[PDB]
Amino acid sequence: AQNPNCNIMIFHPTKEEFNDFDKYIAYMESQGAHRAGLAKIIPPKEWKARETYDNISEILIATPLQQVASGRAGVFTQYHKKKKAMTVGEYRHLANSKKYQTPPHQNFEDLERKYWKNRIYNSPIYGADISGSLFDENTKQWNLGHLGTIQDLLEKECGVVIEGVNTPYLYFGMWKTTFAWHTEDMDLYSINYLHLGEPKTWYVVPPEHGQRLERLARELFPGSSRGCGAFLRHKVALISPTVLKENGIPFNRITQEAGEFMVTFPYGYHAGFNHGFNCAEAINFATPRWIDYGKMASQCSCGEARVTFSMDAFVRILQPERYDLWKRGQD
Ligand SMILES: O=C(O)CNC(=O)C(=O)O
Ligand SMILES: [Mg+2]
Ligand code: NI
Ligand SMILES: [Zn+2]
Known part of the structure; x- marks a missing residue:
């Protein structure tokens, strides 16, 4: 079995290997990457997402969220308090302000x-x-x-x-x-x-x-x-x-830097934090191997979780026994 200790793997695909997304996910899994729950992919040097980030300041953040904690330093919950709308340029200025900016630090471990x-x-x-x-x-x-x-x-x-x-x-x-x-x-x-x-x-x-x-x-x-x-x-x-x-819970950690991709795998629990002002893009996707995990996914039916429109069909088709209870929690 590949990667039996479930370490986070880091991949460096070539430009040719970067062409076919599905094929490269399947390749990473052939090397055991999914066992960790998370992998890093460093794009080839020839690749770029876009030309520049000089023109993003006018994007609107309609409902910024203030994350207020309760509990103790190592075991806490957070709730999200809604704030008034602001642009990305206004948010960047706020992140860099004395109240919110990253403190001085020696290295990632110190931070x-x-x-x-x-x-x-x-x-x-x-x-x-x-x-x-x-x-x-x-x-x-x-x-x-x-x-x-x-x-x-x-x-x-x-x-x-x-x-x-x-x-x-x-x-x-x-x-x-x-x-x-x-x-x-x-x-x-x-x-x-x-x-x-x-x-x-x-x-x-x-x-x-x-x-x-x-x-x-x-x-x-x-x-x-x-x-x-x-x-x-x-x-x-x-x-x-x-x-x-x-508490003896198996886990791993890694820091993602600008220009890097992370993939999370089915049923990989994850958490984390940002170091300072940043912008990320994320999406969910599936492969054939996901289907069996979708069929077994837990579900919240208490009303708290509320999710997108498109989850309805996934529950309806993969989890028909659970569907009526879950949909009630949506309503
Ligand atoms: O960057 C973010 O805020 C959140 N993204 C993720 O947790 C993810 O891709 O699964
Ligand atoms: Mg803009
Ligand atoms: Ni996530
Ligand atoms: Zn719930």
């Missing part, structure tokens, strides 16, 4: 120490889930707006034609902006491209060990667990690397 010591005492503001793309239309390789759709993959594998669409989303981050522990909707893959700015640190649990993380989370967040048998779908819970190590 990680500072994040986990001090995150809860601040409330950073995030632009999230903004439909759109910063890939040039003429970028033909690894263009996250031109991928094969999940509806087409389900139709190809299973024969059923369904409604729904699959488009990318932009993220604008600042120091201490935080992504809570989660798997993707319907335990899909994700791909994330860091277009510009400061890094993102990621944490990930191997898919084969995801239930260990779920059991610790039920212990650490006992009221949330009574409220919902899939409360990690709410995307509000944080647990530090120190707490994970104290």
